[PDB]
Enzyme design. Structure first.
Site, mmCIF file in Angstrom:
data_model
loop_
_atom_site.group_PDB
_atom_site.id
_atom_site.type_symbol
_atom_site.label_atom_id
_atom_site.label_comp_id
_atom_site.label_asym_id
_atom_site.label_seq_id
_atom_site.Cartn_x
_atom_site.Cartn_y
_atom_site.Cartn_z
ATOM 1 N N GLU A 1 -1.069 -33.832 -4.937
ATOM 2 C CA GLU A 1 -2.076 -33.149 -6.088
ATOM 3 C C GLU A 1 -1.585 -32.496 -6.802
ATOM 4 O O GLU A 1 -0.398 -31.787 -6.743
ATOM 5 C CB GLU A 1 -3.291 -32.832 -5.143
ATOM 6 N N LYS B 1 -15.382 -4.631 -10.115
ATOM 7 C CA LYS B 1 -14.590 -5.563 -10.725
ATOM 8 C C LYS B 1 -14.355 -6.625 -9.882
ATOM 9 O O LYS B 1 -14.588 -7.798 -10.241
ATOM 10 C CB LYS B 1 -13.265 -4.883 -10.992
ATOM 11 N N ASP B 2 -13.932 -6.623 -8.503
ATOM 12 C CA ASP B 2 -13.633 -7.524 -7.609
ATOM 13 C C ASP B 2 -14.855 -8.472 -7.318
ATOM 14 O O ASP B 2 -14.878 -9.555 -7.457
ATOM 15 C CB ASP B 2 -13.361 -6.946 -6.345
ATOM 16 N N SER C 1 -0.266 -0.723 -6.956
ATOM 17 C CA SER C 1 -0.073 -1.712 -8.165
ATOM 18 C C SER C 1 0.508 -1.158 -9.374
ATOM 19 O O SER C 1 0.048 -0.132 -10.219
ATOM 20 C CB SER C 1 -1.576 -2.067 -8.245
ATOM 21 N N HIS D 1 1.004 -1.290 0.093
ATOM 22 C CA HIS D 1 0.058 0.113 -0.046
ATOM 23 C C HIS D 1 0.785 1.393 0.000
ATOM 24 O O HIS D 1 0.724 2.634 -0.361
ATOM 25 C CB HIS D 1 -1.052 0.025 1.095
HETATM 26 C C1 HEM Z 1 -2.331 -16.190 0.475
HETATM 27 C C2 HEM Z 1 -1.611 -15.657 -0.597
HETATM 28 C C3 HEM Z 1 -2.088 -14.192 -1.294
HETATM 29 C C4 HEM Z 1 -2.872 -13.252 -0.935
HETATM 30 C C5 HEM Z 1 -4.303 -13.515 -0.059
HETATM 31 C C6 HEM Z 1 -2.537 -12.107 -1.615
HETATM 32 C C7 HEM Z 1 -3.279 -10.891 -1.792
HETATM 33 C C8 HEM Z 1 -2.972 -9.708 -2.513
HETATM 34 C C9 HEM Z 1 -3.810 -8.642 -2.850
HETATM 35 C C10 HEM Z 1 -5.114 -8.407 -2.446
HETATM 36 C C11 HEM Z 1 -3.119 -7.899 -3.669
HETATM 37 C C12 HEM Z 1 -3.679 -6.604 -4.245
HETATM 38 C C13 HEM Z 1 -4.224 -6.631 -5.577
HETATM 39 C C14 HEM Z 1 -3.262 -7.492 -6.697
HETATM 40 O O1 HEM Z 1 -2.462 -6.692 -7.166
HETATM 41 O O2 HEM Z 1 -3.726 -8.595 -7.025
HETATM 42 C C15 HEM Z 1 -1.915 -8.299 -4.027
HETATM 43 C C16 HEM Z 1 -0.779 -8.054 -4.610
HETATM 44 C C17 HEM Z 1 0.467 -8.618 -4.861
HETATM 45 N N1 HEM Z 1 1.011 -9.723 -4.302
HETATM 46 FE FE1 HEM Z 1 -0.228 -10.815 -3.592
HETATM 47 N N2 HEM Z 1 -1.200 -12.223 -2.446
HETATM 48 C C18 HEM Z 1 -1.069 -13.793 -1.988
HETATM 49 C C19 HEM Z 1 -0.001 -14.383 -2.489
HETATM 50 C C20 HEM Z 1 1.058 -13.694 -2.949
HETATM 51 C C21 HEM Z 1 2.314 -14.308 -3.657
HETATM 52 C C22 HEM Z 1 2.402 -15.947 -3.391
HETATM 53 C C23 HEM Z 1 2.991 -13.557 -4.179
HETATM 54 C C24 HEM Z 1 4.369 -13.848 -4.994
HETATM 55 C C25 HEM Z 1 5.375 -14.376 -4.428
HETATM 56 C C26 HEM Z 1 2.522 -12.188 -3.856
HETATM 57 C C27 HEM Z 1 2.706 -11.019 -4.344
HETATM 58 C C28 HEM Z 1 2.168 -10.111 -4.650
HETATM 59 C C29 HEM Z 1 2.710 -8.548 -5.214
HETATM 60 C C30 HEM Z 1 4.225 -8.483 -5.757
HETATM 61 C C31 HEM Z 1 1.678 -7.872 -5.437
HETATM 62 C C32 HEM Z 1 1.708 -6.436 -6.258
HETATM 63 C C33 HEM Z 1 1.544 -6.531 -7.691
HETATM 64 C C34 HEM Z 1 1.218 -5.023 -8.250
HETATM 65 O O3 HEM Z 1 0.213 -4.793 -8.008
HETATM 66 O O4 HEM Z 1 1.942 -4.349 -8.942
HETATM 67 N N3 HEM Z 1 1.334 -12.297 -3.409
HETATM 68 N N4 HEM Z 1 -1.588 -9.471 -3.282
#
Ligand code: HEM
Ligand code: HEM
Lengths: 379, 48, 33, 112, 62, 43, 106
Positions: A271, A227-228, A205, A201
């Site tokens: 799996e 959208k969400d 993004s 935040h």
């Molecule tokens: C429990 C699993 C996860 C949840 C609940 C979660 C949640 C979120 C949410 C709500 C956002 C903001 C919207 C979006 O960009 O899609 C986001 C962004 C991001 N997440 Fe995840 N995340 C998860 C797993 C991961 C993993 C596995 C990675 C990478 C190793 C990761 C890296 C990122 C990054 C780098 C962003 C920012 C990208 C951008 O918007 O430019 N997240 N995450």
């Protein structure tokens, strides 16, 4: 300010990260996986707590218990199958999430990418333990083979595998432990997800184009909340399509057989979400070499930020990397195929090449392609 | 094996019917909400 | 600030009784001559 | 008569926004409107009475915090805006209704 | 002139959110019943005589 | 408590009842699906 | 000894630029840059004209991305017009920081 509900309560202000926050305009559908990822965690959680409202964690019963949840309990059948199918979704969604930051340079957010990585590997442990709870043939043997894979460590390993199991095999001891850890990991995970969102935040993004959008920023509430909601709509669609029309389809394992410790499905395999790792592990003759290589498959992720060579954090404007990017996904798909394959010549030789092609694509090919592209642009 | 599934299949039919109405409805809502972003015109007009 | 490029601006001060009279009010506020 | 005849046609009402961003400028001007009645209409005096209530406000109003119109009080109190006025623009077939506020870059949303 | 169906609907039910929600509550009720009814019937049709509902006769009251 | 009570406030209350009144109806509808009164079903 | 190679090298370059989304998008190679600390300072050093221009082109770009539409064939960025306007600025910034790093050795 007076009577501006939002900033009045300090607590309610904290929630205006949903409503007022700067959101990029342009923004592929891919982003909807973050939100969806969190819907999946909440779904899993409510489901889990209702399943764990009628489950027992003993050798004798477990099987029965699950079997009782799906027969005599009211709407426990869907709750359970929703549960099982959910986790598939949870993973399908996670691998879209990682692909999008592998492609678009979202991983530039070092801090946020290291929390992601932690997230991904936490969710991996939960899914590994939850599949054994039922205590079915597949589960039983899968946790033996994986855990024992840890006994490749030379000095400790051996002692350590026996600590984890709480005995010499996988009897009650081990099955209650998994129940406890499965239940408490998703609650720890939720705090990590919120710590993840915290960091993210601070910089907002990224986009397709790869360029700052501060010049074109949209209110999250008006636009993104719909959208969400829409993305949920589709998400649930897939969940229910799966869980209502083809309950078992995506749950490869047909082993609804109570575990018999002398008995073995010659075809033992994690799996779908784990196949990649599996295949990469079998490619190595040596046990220890495999375990390290197994780890590196997944742990390799944190190194990408250092590996980035180009000047355009966006793959969008770079051909050659787009081409290798895709290959690696299709290589990944190739490796998942090997996972459900007899471990014989045909698959062996394939897997091995696949395993090298994966590491090449990540460790050597792409990096070079990055340079080249930069030099073609005269950068 | 799957006593619940036979009953579940009927729900699936209802779900499928529900999903189409819902999937279509969601898209319309998204378009209306996301309509403003698409509609807007951007231009640069320096005195230069 | 309002651009004062053309023949339009003549502003110069000189009234009968009042000269440079400044008025401040909640409803309004100003500077005259 | 023909020249008059061209005149008096209705002018289609459209709710759109036009956003012309110039971070170079020190303040921000916002004019927000909802289309209104022609020149003659019973609703057209009642509106006025309405805007009497919201009112209008400037850096230099002597009442500030004690002024009886909330937008003014809030504004006065919280340094929300520099100046704001509600208007009723009255045309034969069209009308522009709303207010207009000038406010620092960081206070556009709160005054909205 | 009259209001399009929607404009009629609008001014009666959707100006005030109080009425809007009232609507929705009402609607959710009415809807559930017809969906079911219609959705159920559809499903039973596709398995004529395959379901107990169809088969109860055989061993019922002689 | 005492401060909240006022001669002036009544229009808001009247307005609230409709929105409140409309809101009240929704709960009955919401409760009823869960409650499944045979009488409610009969209605 | 690059005569044929230079021309060949030049030929390869036009295809990549034309091939790249940036040419299609209408944002010049310089606007596609990963905004990092050095780029950031070079950006800040841009003239009102140069600078405001980058803001509009990215504005128009992110607008197209959002709508998934490409700009008309007539209005595209042509390789022959490689405004490397950032380059100048970007160079120094790095130049200055390299120096600083080097001055810190001992
Ligand atoms: C429990 C699993 C996860 C949840 C609940 C979660 C949640 C979120 C949410 C709500 C956002 C903001 C919207 C979006 O960009 O899609 C986001 C962004 C991001 N997440 Fe995840 N995340 C998860 C797993 C991961 C993993 C596995 C990675 C990478 C190793 C990761 C890296 C990122 C990054 C780098 C962003 C920012 C990208 C951008 O918007 O430019 N997240 N995450
Ligand atoms: C996102 C994290 C979670 C993931 C990936 C996950 C996944 C799984 C999986 C894959 C299984 C095996 C089911 C089968 O194939 O039969 C399972 C079972 C189970 N999980 Fe979860 N789960 C998660 C969170 C939770 C939570 C939060 C709870 C409780 C609060 C929970 C409680 C249970 C219970 C009690 C079972 C055993 C009954 C059954 O077999 O369904 N899980 N979980």
């Amino acid at each position: 300010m007076t009577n501006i509900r939002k900033s009045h309560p300090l607590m309610k202000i904290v929630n205006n990260a949903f409503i007022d926050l700067p959101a990029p305009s342009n923004i592929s559908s891919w982003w909807n996986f973050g939100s969806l990822l969190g819907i999946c965690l909440i779904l899993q959680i409510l489901t889990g707590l209702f399943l764990a409202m009628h489950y027992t964690s003993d050798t004798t019963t477990a099987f029965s218990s699950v079997t009782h949840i799906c027969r005599d309990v009211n709407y426990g059948w869907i709750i359970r199958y929703m549960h099982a199918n959910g986790a598939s979704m949870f993973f399908i969604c996670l691998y879209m999430h990682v692909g999008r930051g592998l492609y678009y340079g979202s991983y530039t957010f070092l801090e946020t990418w290291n929390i992601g990585v932690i997230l991904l590997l936490t969710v991996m442990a939960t899914a590994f333990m939850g599949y054994v709870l039922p205590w079915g043939q597949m589960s039983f043997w899968g946790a033996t083979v994986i855990t024992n894979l840890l006994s490749a460590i030379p000095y400790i390993g051996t002692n350590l595998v026996e600590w984890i199991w709480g005995g010499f095999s996988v009897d009650k001891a081990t099955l209650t432990r998994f129940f406890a850890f499965h239940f408490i990991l998703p609650f720890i995970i939720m705090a990590i997800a919120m710590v993840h969102l915290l960091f993210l935040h601070e910089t907002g993004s990224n986009n397709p184009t790869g360029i700052s959008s501060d010049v074109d920023k949209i209110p999250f509430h008006p636009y993104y909340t719909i959208k969400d909601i829409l993305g949920a709509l589709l998400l649930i669609l897939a969940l229910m399509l799966l869980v209502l029309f083809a309950p078992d389809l995506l749950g490869d394992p047909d082993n609804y057989t109570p575990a018999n410790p002398l008995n073995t499905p010659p075809h033992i395999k994690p799996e779908w979400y784990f196949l990649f790792a599996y295949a990469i592990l079998r490619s190595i003759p040596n046990k220890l070499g495999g375990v390290l290589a197994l780890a590196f498959s997944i742990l390799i992720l944190a190194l990408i930020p250092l590996l980035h060579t180009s000047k355009q954090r966006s793959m969008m404007f770079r051909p050659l990397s787009q081409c290798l990017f895709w290959a690696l996904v299709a290589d990944l798909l190739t490796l998942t195929w090997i996972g459900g394959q007899p471990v014989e010549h045909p698959y062996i030789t394939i897997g091995q090449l696949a395993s090298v092609l994966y590491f090449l694509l990540i460790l050597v090919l792409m990096p070079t392609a990055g340079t080249i592209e930069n030099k073609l642009l005269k950068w | 094996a799957e006593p619940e599934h036979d009953h579940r299949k009927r729900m699936g039919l209802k779900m499928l019917l529900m999903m189409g109405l819902l999937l279509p409805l969601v898209y319309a809502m998204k378009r209306h909400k996301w309509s403003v972003l698409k509609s807007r015109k951007l231009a640069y007009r320096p005195p230069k | 600030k309002r651009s004062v490029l053309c023949r339009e601006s003549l502003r110069g001060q000189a009234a009968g009784r009042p000269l440079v009279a400044s008025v401040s009010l909640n409803v309004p506020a100003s500077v005259r001559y | 008569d023909e020249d008059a005849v061209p005149t008096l046609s209705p002018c289609r009402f459209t709710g759109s926004q036009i956003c012309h961003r110039e971070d170079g400028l020190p303040l921000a001007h916002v004019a927000i409107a909802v289309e209104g009645p022609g020149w003659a209409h019973p609703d057209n005096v009642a509106l006025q009475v309405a805007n009497a209530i919201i009112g209008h406000y400037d850096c230099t109003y002597g009442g500030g915090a004690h002024l009886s119109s909330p937008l003014a009080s809030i504004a006065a109190t919280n340094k929300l805006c520099q100046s704001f006025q509600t208007f009723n623009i009255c045309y034969a077939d069209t009308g522009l209704l709303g207010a207009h506020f000038v406010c620092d870059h960081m206070s556009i949303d709160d005054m909205m | 002139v009259a209001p399009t169906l929607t404009a009629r609907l609008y001014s009666l039910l959707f100006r005030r959110t109080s009425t809007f929600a009232l609507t929705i509550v009402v609607g959710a009720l009415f809807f559930e019943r017809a969906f079911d009814q219609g959705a159920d019937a559809i499903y039973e049709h596709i398995n004529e005589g395959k379901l107990w509902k169809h088969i109860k006769h055989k061993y019922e009251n002689k | 408590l005492t401060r909240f009570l006022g001669p002036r406030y009544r229009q808001l209350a009247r307005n609230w009842v409709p929105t409140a009144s409309l809101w009240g109806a929704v709960g009955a509808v919401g409760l009823v699906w869960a409650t499944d009164w045979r009488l409610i079903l009969d209605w | 000894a690059v005569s044929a190679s230079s021309r060949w090298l030049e030929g390869i370059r036009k295809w990549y630029y034309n091939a790249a989304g940036f040419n299609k998008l209408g944002l010049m190679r310089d606007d596609t840059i990963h905004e990092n600390d050095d780029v950031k300072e070079a950006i800040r050093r841009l003239p009102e004209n140069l600078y405001d221009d980058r803001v509009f082109r990215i504005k128009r770009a992110l607008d197209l991305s959002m709508r998934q539409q490409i700009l008309p064939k007539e209005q595209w960025t042509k390789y022959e017009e490689d405004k490397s306007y950032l380059e100048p600025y970007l160079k120094e910034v790095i130049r200055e920081r390299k120096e600083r790093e080097e001055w810190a050795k001992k």
